[PDB]
Amino acid sequence: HWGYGKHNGPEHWHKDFPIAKGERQSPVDIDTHTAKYDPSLKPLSVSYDQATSLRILNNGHAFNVEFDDSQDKAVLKGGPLDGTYRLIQFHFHWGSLDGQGSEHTVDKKKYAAELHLVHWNTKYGDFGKAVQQPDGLAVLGIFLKVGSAKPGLQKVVDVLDSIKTKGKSADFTNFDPRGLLPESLDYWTYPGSLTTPPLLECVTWIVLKEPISVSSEQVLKFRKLNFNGEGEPEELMVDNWRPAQPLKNRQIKASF
Numbered sequence: 001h002w003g004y005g006k007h008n009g010p011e012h013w014h015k016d017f018p019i020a021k022g023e024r025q026s027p028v029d030i031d032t033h034t035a036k037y038d039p040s041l042k043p044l045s046v047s048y049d050q051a052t053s054l055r056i057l058n059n060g061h062a063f064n065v066e067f068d069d070s071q072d073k074a075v076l077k078g079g080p081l082d083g084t085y086r087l088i089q090f091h092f093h094w095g096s097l098d099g100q101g102s103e104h105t106v107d108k109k110k111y112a113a114e115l116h117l118v119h120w121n122t123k124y125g126d127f128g129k130a131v132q133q134p135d136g137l138a139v140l141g142i143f144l145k146v147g148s149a150k151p152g153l154q155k156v157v158d159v160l161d162s163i164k165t166k167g168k169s170a171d172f173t174n175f176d177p178r179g180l181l182p183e184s185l186d187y188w189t190y191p192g193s194l195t196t197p198p199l200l201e202c203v204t205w206i207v208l209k210e211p212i213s214v215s216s217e218q219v220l221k222f223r224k225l226n227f228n229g230e231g232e233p234e235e236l237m238v239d240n241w242r243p244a245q246p247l248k249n250r251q252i253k254a255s256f
């Protein structure tokens with residue numbers, strides 16, 4: 001019954017998911033002075049023009065915006081990646097306060113939140129097979145800071161009222177994820193894992209350097225979500241982030 005509380009939080013996950021203490025866990029701190037420019041990286045290609053969203057779901061630990069991945073539409077390619085990866089969902093991690101909420105950290109700085117756009121390697125046929133492979137997933141991670149509002153986020157903010165509690169979903173078509181991207185695609189990359197149980201080590205992380213800014217009002221509505229289900233005592237959905245994990249035998253590479 002994993003979660004982020006005192007008795008079921010990240011320091012407890014290893015009992016049910018021993019890979020929590022593995023050799024390529026995520027997230028990590030990005031030490032900007034140790035990450036090296038890699039000129040062997042190909043230009044990154046984020047092609048979300050034909051993305052088609054279907055639904056939004058509160059799964060008891062975050063909310064997922066799900067996409068139709070039955071065809072070749074929204075794809076991530078290039079950069080560190082061999083081949084093409086298909087968008088299946090995005091979600092966020094955020095804090096109870098503006099001073100924390102991100103998973104990755106940059107010179108130990110915590111951002112207010114972090115966007116994860118999840119993609120699976122189409123060479124493995126579906127998501128389920130891809131998460132049995134060391135290169136089965138690519139997560140594009142984007143930091144959020146509190147400042148000016150992000151117009152492209154408002155449609156997400158505005159449906160959260162209808163999925164307050166665990167297991168609630170709402171139709172969510174025609175959402176364009178291009179509206180969540182910053183100007184620059186400069187990034188850091190490293191091999192890692194899912195940051196939630198089952199913490200599978202299948203992910204090529206691509207973490208953008210440029211944060212997007214969101215309004216205090218926008219992230220306060222994230223914090224009105226519930227971890228609990230309908231009719232249960234209210235436990236606000238905040239601090240659904242895993243702290244930085246040991247880098248072990250990994251190198252973070254810079255695209256810039």
Ligand SMILES: O=C1NS(=O)(=O)c2ccccc21
Nearest residue numbers: 116117118139193194195196
């Ligand atoms: O919660 C998550 N954070 S993540 O982007 O590593 C990820 C990948 C796949 C499934 C879930 C999750």
Ligand SMILES: [Hg+2]
Nearest residue numbers: 132133201202
């Ligand atoms: Hg894997």
Ligand SMILES: [Zn+2]
Nearest residue numbers: 059060061062
């Ligand atoms: Zn959950």
Ligand SMILES: [Zn+2]
Nearest residue numbers: 092093116195
């Ligand atoms: Zn995530």
